């Protein structure tokens, strides 16, 4: 299968630099220009620049002129992008794409799978779990767990050791100003089951080798 | 005053040529304020061959001993809106580039600024009444990041950084 | 080049005719490309040069336009066409148009959670507001501390559309220090939504 494979997701401190690879699988660069397009978590697509694989010449967007550098390795058919002096605004998914050199227009094809680059001043930290105790809506009560201050993604949250999966709404994590992630995992259960059913959230954070089980009790 | 280009190795004085044109690349992305940016070409030998204004001398960035224009300088491109398509410049008055032999080739600063202003005026025709800015090469292999040319069983590499560092309103 | 792609989002049922418009500010002739990006994947080219169809794309997709006004149309929406669509011309992309699923209006069930003492021992207090299973996503959460409007200390999170009831869920977190949490007594999150006649408030007093 002809495709463009990229390097894994990376986390960098603000002010550092990240180098992303884009290796051609099943094709060579000699007939195309390689472009890089980034996409912030909820934003649109932004073009960074292209590189000529025969000459190494480049044309970066003026937004990144002084801080981005594109290279290529013809012997292994791999394009590189290194972004220097990283800032929090640079957190995005970075794609590479193929554009024909002989084409009259730019038709982005054979995109990479994407590379998530996260800029944050935090170090690997295990998450602290706090319960969201149910309290005095109708026949259904709401309870959850608060997973605060961890880095990096992801964390897996199960309820009752994986037995409770109906009505669970685990929200996407949010990067805080401290540089740490925080999410909430909630589940709606009948008010009758409170006091007669034990609810435990099981949080797993593989980057820090931390597993935390928190039992959520009412009043 | 003159503009000095460090070369390697040292070109003998008999390798002095006439700059009869150059090849450019327009910088893309969302531009700021009233500026359009141009650099030495980021393409390969395909972009130089598309010009068909060069002579017997193989050369990057600058065309040496090539074809001159009739009256005024004239520019071409397959597509003015495609920054991946290089801009071919054909001068009308050639600029003399004379090498001393000690590793530095020289160019008249006044006559180079004279031709750059003619280039910037012709570029404003294709992109509107804007500020034209020339900047050094974005990078690449030594053959294309430098002004490279062959001369009598040799091949020199001259940094053209001092040639592209002006602004034109 | 400025790319204005509208609308930003739209909701349609299965089988309806979806029409997305991208209009440029300058004459780009017939060359305009349309990409489809499903969540978590890379963009995929569907329409090139306004009207032509890339190989392998179903015939329900179509596009038209020339000069500055362009339209992208899906004749019969399918369960595999929900995505965000972008128009692209050289290095410039459109803002994008996310395709969503239309269901009946659903009011959110609102809950509030005071910070647990286990967190109070850490020196920080997080108050969590919940809006469970509602439609449409367009909602507004306001945090009120001592009946005073709060700003800059709230963080919102929206779940992706549910595959079952096609609704959304919302979590707003208010983070204060312990020293600041112990001062003011009353905490409330007010919510405004289409499914609510009047704005709904859930509140609690610290220490009750
Ligand atoms: C250009 O022509 C002159 C005049 O014949 C010659 O001396 C010079 O070497 C030529 N330049 C190159 C690079 O061959
Ligand atoms: C370059 O052009 C000048 C006139 O501008 C002419 O005298 C000269 O012979 C040409 N060639 C060289 C190598 O100087
Ligand atoms: C550039 O190419 C596109 C696509 O082929 C075409 O629509 C457009 O008119 C071209 N522009 C110029 C100035 O040739």
Q: How many CB atoms lie within 10 A of CB C112?
A: 19
Cβ contact B145–A62 (<8 Å)? no
Q: How was this structure determined?
A: X-ray
Residue A17 and residue A88 in one domain: yes
| A209 Cβ closer than 6 Å to some ligand 3 atom | no
Domain that holds residue A112: 3-119
DSSP codes of every residue in B25-65? EE--SS--TTEEEEEE--S-HHHHHHH----SS-BSSEEES
Of A47, A56, A104, the CB nearest to B140: A56
The C-alpha atoms of residue A195 and residue A193 are separated, in whole angstroms, by 6
Cβ contact A57–B29 (<8 Å)? no
Structure-block tokens of residue B153 = 């069983």
Q: How many helices (H) and strands (E) does chain B have?
A: 3, 11
Question: Closest approach of chain A CAs to the CA of C102, in angstroms?
Answer: 20
Residue A60 and residue A160 in one domain: no
The C-alpha atoms of residue B14 and residue C187 are separated, in whole angstroms, by 86
Residues 6+ apart with CB under 8 A from C55: none
Residue A21 and residue A92 in one domain: yes
Which of A96, A119, A142 is a domain's end point?
Answer: A119
Phi, psi (rounded to 5 degrees) for C200: -95, 135
Domain with CATH 2.60.40.10 in chain C: 3-101, 109-205
* Beta bridge partner(s), residue C145: C148, C187
Q: Which residues of C145-172 are buried (b: 16+ CB within 10 A; e: fewer)?
A: beeeebeeebeebebebeeeebbbbbbb
The C-alpha atoms of residue B20 and residue B55 are separated, in whole angstroms, by 10
Cβ contact B29–C90 (<8 Å)? no
Q: What's the B17 CA to ligand 2 centre distance in angstroms?
A: 7
Angle CA(A31)–CA(A82)–CA(B45) in degrees, nearest 5?
A: 30
Q: How many CB atoms lie within 10 A of CB A117?
A: 19
Residues 6+ apart with CB under 8 A from C205: C185, C186, C187
Residue A93 and residue A142 in one domain: no
* Beta bridge partner(s), residue C140: C192
SS3 B94: strand
Q: How many CB atoms lie within 10 A of CB A48?
A: 23
Residue A71 and residue A177 in one domain: no
Cβ contact A171–C171 (<8 Å)? yes
Which of A93, A119, A145 is a domain's end point?
Answer: A119
CATH of the domain at A32: 2.60.40.10
The C-alpha atoms of residue C100 and residue C18 are separated, in whole angstroms, by 11
| B32 Cβ closer than 6 Å to some ligand 3 atom | no
Atom 9 of ligand 2, nearest CA residue? B18
Ramachandran region, residue B123 (left: φ > 0; alpha: ψ -120 to 50; beta: rest): alpha
Rg, C-alpha atoms of chain B: 15
CA distances from A59 to A48, B8, C32, C96, C131 (A): 9, 26, 22, 25, 47
| Helix, strand, coil shares, percent, chain A, to 5 | 5, 50, 45
Residue A105 and residue A144 in one domain: no
Longest dimension (CA), chain C: 68
Domain count, chain A: 2
The C-alpha atoms of residue B30 and residue A99 are separated, in whole angstroms, by 20
Residue A108 and residue A37 in one domain: yes
Q: What residues 98-127 of chain B have any CB closer than 8 A to a CB of chain A? A: none
Angle CA(B29)–CA(B31)–CA(B36) in degrees, nearest 5?
A: 105
Class of the CATH domain delimited by C109-205: mainly beta
The C-alpha atoms of residue C98 and residue C48 are separated, in whole angstroms, by 19
| Nearest C-alpha neighbor of A98 from the set A208, A170, A192, A22 | A22
Residue A154 and residue A48 in one domain: no
SS3 A107: coil
Domain count, chain B: 1
CATH of the domain at B31: 2.170.40.20
| CATH topology for the C3-101 domain | Immunoglobulin-like (2.60.40)
Residue A153 and residue A184 in one domain: yes
The C-alpha atoms of residue C121 and residue B126 are separated, in whole angstroms, by 67
Tell me the chain C residues in contact with residue B81 when contact means C-beta distances shorter than 8 Å.
28, 90
Tell me the chain A residues in contact with residue C86 when contact means C-beta distances shorter than 8 Å.
44-45
Residue A58 and residue A138 in one domain: no
Residue A11 and residue A114 in one domain: yes
| Cis bond before residue B16 (omega within 30° of 0) | no
Domain that holds residue B45: 2-168
């Amino acid at each position: 299968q002809v495709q463009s494979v990229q390097s894994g997701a990376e986390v960098k401190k603000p002010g550092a630099s990240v180098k992303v690879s884009c290796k051609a699988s099943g094709y060579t660069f000699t007939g195309y220009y390689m472009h890089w397009v980034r996409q912030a978590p909820g934003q649109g697509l932004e073009w960074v620049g292209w590189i000529n694989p025969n000459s190494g010449g480049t044309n970066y967007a003026q937004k990144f002129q002084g801080r981005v550098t594109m290279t290529r390795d013809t012997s292994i058919s791999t394009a590189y992008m290194e972004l220097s002096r990283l800032r929090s605004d640079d957190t995005a998914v970075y794609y590479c794409a193929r554009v024909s050199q002989y084409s009259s227009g730019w038709y982005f094809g054979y995109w990479g799978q994407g590379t998530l680059v996260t800029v944050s001043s935090a170090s690997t930290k295990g998450p602290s779990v706090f319960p969201l105790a149910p309290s005095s809506s109708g026949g259904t009560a709401a309870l959850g767990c608060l997973v605060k201050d961890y880095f990096p993604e992801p964390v897996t949250v199960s309820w009752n050791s994986g037995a409770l999966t109906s009505g669970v709404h685990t929200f996407p994590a949010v990067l805080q100003s401290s540089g740490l992630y925080s999410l909430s995992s909630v589940v709606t259960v009948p008010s009758s089951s409170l006091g007669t059913q034990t609810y435990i959230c099981n949080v797993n954070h593989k980057p820090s080798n931390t597993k935390v089980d928190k039992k959520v009790e009412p009043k | 005053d003159t503009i000095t280009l460090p070369c390697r190795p040292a070109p003998p004085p008999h390798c002095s040529s006439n700059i009869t044109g150059l090849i450019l690349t327009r910088q893309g992305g969302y531009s700021n304020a009233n500026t359009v940016i141009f650099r030495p070409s980021g393409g390969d030998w395909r972009d130089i061959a598309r010009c068909q204004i060069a002579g017997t001398v193989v050369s990057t960035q600058l065309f040496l001993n090539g074809s001159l224009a009739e009256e005024e300088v004239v520019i071409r491109s397959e597509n003015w809106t495609d920054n991946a398509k290089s801009i071919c410049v054909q001068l009308a008055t050639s600029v003399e580039i004379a090498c001393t032999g000690a590793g530095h080739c020289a160019i008249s600063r006044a006559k180079w600024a004279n031709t750059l202003k003619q280039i910037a005026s012709k570029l404003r025709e294709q992109y509107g009444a804007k500020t034209i800015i020339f900047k050094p090469s974005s990078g690449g292999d030594p053959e294309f990041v430098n002004h490279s040319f062959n001369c009598g069983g040799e091949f020199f590499y001259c940094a053209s950084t001092q040639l592209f560092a002006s602004t034109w309103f | 080049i400025q790319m204005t792609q509208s609308p930003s989002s739209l909701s349609a049922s299965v089988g309806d005719r979806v029409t997305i418009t991208c209009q440029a500010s300058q004459d780009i002739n017939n060359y305009l490309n349309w990409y489809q990006q499903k969540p978590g994947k890379a963009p995929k080219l569907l329409i090139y040069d306004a009207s032509n169809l890339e190989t392998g794309v179903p015939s329900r997709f179509s596009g038209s336009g020339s000069g500055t006004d362009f339209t992208f149309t899906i004749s019969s929406l399918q369960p595999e066409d929900i995505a965000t669509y972008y128009c692209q011309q050289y290095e410039f992309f459109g803002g994008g148009t996310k395709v969503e699923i239309k269901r009946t209006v659903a009011a959110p069930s609102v809950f509030i959670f005071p910070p647990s003492d286990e967190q109070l021992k850490s020196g920080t207090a997080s108050v969590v507001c919940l809006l469970n299973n509602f439609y449409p996503r367009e909602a507004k959460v306001q945090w009120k501390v001592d009946n005073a409007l709060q700003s800059g200390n709230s963080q919102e999170s929206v779940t992706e559309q549910d595959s079952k009831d096609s609704t959304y869920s919302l979590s707003s977190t208010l983070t204060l220090s312990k020293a600041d949490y112990e001062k003011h007594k009353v905490y409330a999150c007010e919510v405004t939504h289409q499914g609510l006649s009047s704005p709904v408030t859930k509140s609690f007093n610290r220490g009750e």
